[PDB]
Amino acid sequence: WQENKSWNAHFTEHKSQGVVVLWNENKQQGFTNNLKRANQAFLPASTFKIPNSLIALDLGVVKDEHQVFKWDGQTRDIATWNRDHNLITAMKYSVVPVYQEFARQIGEARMSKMLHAFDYGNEDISGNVDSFWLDGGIRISATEQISFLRKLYHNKLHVSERSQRIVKQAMLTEANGDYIIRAKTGYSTRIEPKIGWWVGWVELDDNVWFFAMNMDMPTSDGLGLRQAITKEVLKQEKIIP
Amino acid sequence: WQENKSWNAHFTEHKSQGVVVLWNENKQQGFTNNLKRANQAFLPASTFKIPNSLIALDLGVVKDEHQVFKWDGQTRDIATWNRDHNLITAMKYSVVPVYQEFARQIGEARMSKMLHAFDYGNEDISGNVDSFWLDGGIRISATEQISFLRKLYHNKLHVSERSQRIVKQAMLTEANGDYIIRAKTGYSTRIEPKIGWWVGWVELDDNVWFFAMNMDMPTSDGLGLRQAITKEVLKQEKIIP
Ligand SMILES: O=C(O)c1ccc(-c2cccc(C(=O)O)c2)cc1
């Protein structure tokens, strides 16, 4: 691990505070602008859709990435939620109601066992099994997110290789000739402090850069800064052009 | 199957000639600017890296997408070829020497049986074991490419699902919030007519558009037209913005 306080300039310029954590897989070396916040555990919010997907797929709650989960007919306040989804689009649009149904079908017993198997955060599912990642007891730090994502990247989580490959496909966010980003956003609003998450990794030709960022998110107006600030760090470090 | 000759304007504007074939998976509907050329069989060239990858993986010639195939030290005309590669980068940069090694390991007997099992093109491997897809007897039409790609997309090829998932991952070319393109370029230069290929599919939120295009390619200078003309068709059909 190494601290680079120059990345704070990317938070200060947008009048925000947070942490970006990078992990160079080839060098087995990590970097961050705030090592203490890098190890501070927060609610994972919708970044929990990564382990949730893995568990649901491995248990057969989700058959594959094509299975359609019908809209339940309740009109909610994000338009993308009021439609049918598969695993790919439910993750892409952070469709909480779809994943709440996953968690209910997983059940608390299997959810707790799998999170312990995953070594995921504090492994605590206090609260409702269908909302504990938004207002329950689960807590995870950016470094714990990287450690979890690293296992997922190497297919070393205690689930089938197939489940891990499907979830890594579902995490696909952006890709061109220069890089591939597999990642998941998070927005924790039910319990203070309100924060935004972005966790994942950048695949290059000859290396992988794991990243986990969170930042204070008092309003929804700064949600785009999760990707913007992370990308500025990635560009400064010559990871992406 | 419906013919739309208005797409010829995209070929004519670049003083080019070729065919684009689209398959709407949801509607089970096919479209092309030239029905006859859509069913004319050409050398697959480097689009054969899709079945070649699947066979190498299923036979254990390639263990996974991380296995490094070290540069043999011979400096070739393509700069990106003169380095170590894995399955991902070898597909991305169409590293023929890496796949010629795969084909030599597969051998004629297993290659022929697998292509027969794949129902791939004319299923004929006549010629050299490590170059038949560039100057041998194998031929495939644009519609036969789509028929093959649909099987791959649905994990219905005879090989393991894992092999098909690894290859679909390697086919990743481009992705954003609007669409995902999994595809493979090809350039057939050894036997006339010299043609460029681009085959794959466009993943949308609620549909998948399979595509297979080829076009006359007298020099490498116009290889960018493969993606450019295809995207103009995709834009015209309101598939990508
Ligand atoms: O009920 C909750 O707690 C909750 C509600 C909405 C979101 C959400 C919806 C769409 C995008 C995003 C984003 O992070 O961009 C977040 C997250 C959580």
Ligand SMILES: O=C(O)c1ccc(-c2cccc(C(=O)O)c2)cc1
């Ligand atoms: O020896 C042959 O026949 C051969 C040689 C090179 C290529 C090639 C190299 C890089 C990109 C592309 C492309 O299609 O963009 C093609 C293909 C075939």
Ligand SMILES: [Cl-]
């Ligand atoms: Cl992918």
Ligand code: NA
């Ligand atoms: Na991956």
Ligand code: NA
């Ligand atoms: Na090619």
